[PDB]
Design a protein around this ligand. Structure first.
Ligand SMILES: CCCCCCCCCCCCCCCCCC(=O)OC[C@H](COP(=O)(O)OCCN)OC(=O)CCCCCCCCCCCCCCCCC
Lengths: 80, 89
């Protein structure tokens, strides 16, 4: 019922493609991969990173608070 | 002027054939070609002779989608050998 031939109505659209044996599999891989990755990470880093930053701060604070919770209070054994 | 340049470049006499088929005599046709078709150009006028260049075949695809048409036409081809290669036959 839902196969190729009856998916959508498309008019006046031209597509050009070439054979995979005709073109390279890695056309300028590093020289255009690096700026594209940098663009994607600079468009998403402010939405993604600060929650995990404050997870790191909460994790370190909780671990150190537990460590000083196990620490001996020097105020005890001071009266006698 | 573009038509004049094309006409003076590509209508050379060595690249021309006067062909006749049917009720014709070859000697009469040769005499008529000597009378009328002699001295067309024969000279490229700058010693600038064009050269035929081989064409690169590319395995590729063009898809013109227009869904309002009632029927679809699809052509699939590979590279042919050329005129002078006998395996054409
Ligand atoms: C006011 C924004 C100013 C931005 C200045 C930066 C320069 C902007 C212009 C140059 C372009 C730079 C690149 C742009 C990349 C995409 C755009 C972008 O980053 O936009 C800012 C982004 C979205 O802004 P918007 O959603 O409108 O802000 C509402 C804030 N709630 O908003 C952000 O990224 C802000 C995200 C802040 C998140 C804070 C979360 C704090 C709480 C975390 C709790 C986690 C759990 C804690 C523990 C719970 C249990 C105990």
């Amino acid at each position: 019922g839902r196969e190729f031939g009856n998916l959508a109505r498309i008019r006046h659209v031209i597509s050009y493609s070439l054979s995979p044996f005709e073109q390279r599999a890695f056309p300028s891989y590093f020289s255009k991969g690096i700026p594209n990755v940098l663009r994607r990470t600079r468009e998403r880093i402010l939405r993604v990173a600060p929650p995990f930053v404050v997870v790191y701060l909460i994790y370190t604070w909780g671990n150190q608070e537990f460590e000083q919770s196990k620490r001996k209070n020097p105020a005890m054994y001071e009266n006698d | 002027t573009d038509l004049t340049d094309y006409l003076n470049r590509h209508y050379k006499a060595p690249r021309m054939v006067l062909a006749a088929a049917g009720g014709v005599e070859h000697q009469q046709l040769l005499d008529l070609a000597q009378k009328h078709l002699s001295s067309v150009s024969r000279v490229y006028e700058e010693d600038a002779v064009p050269g035929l260049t081989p064409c690169r075949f590319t395995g590729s695809e063009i898809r013109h989608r227009d869904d309002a048409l009632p029927l679809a036409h699809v052509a699939i081809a590979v590279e042919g050998p050329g005129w002078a290669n006998p395996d054409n036959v």
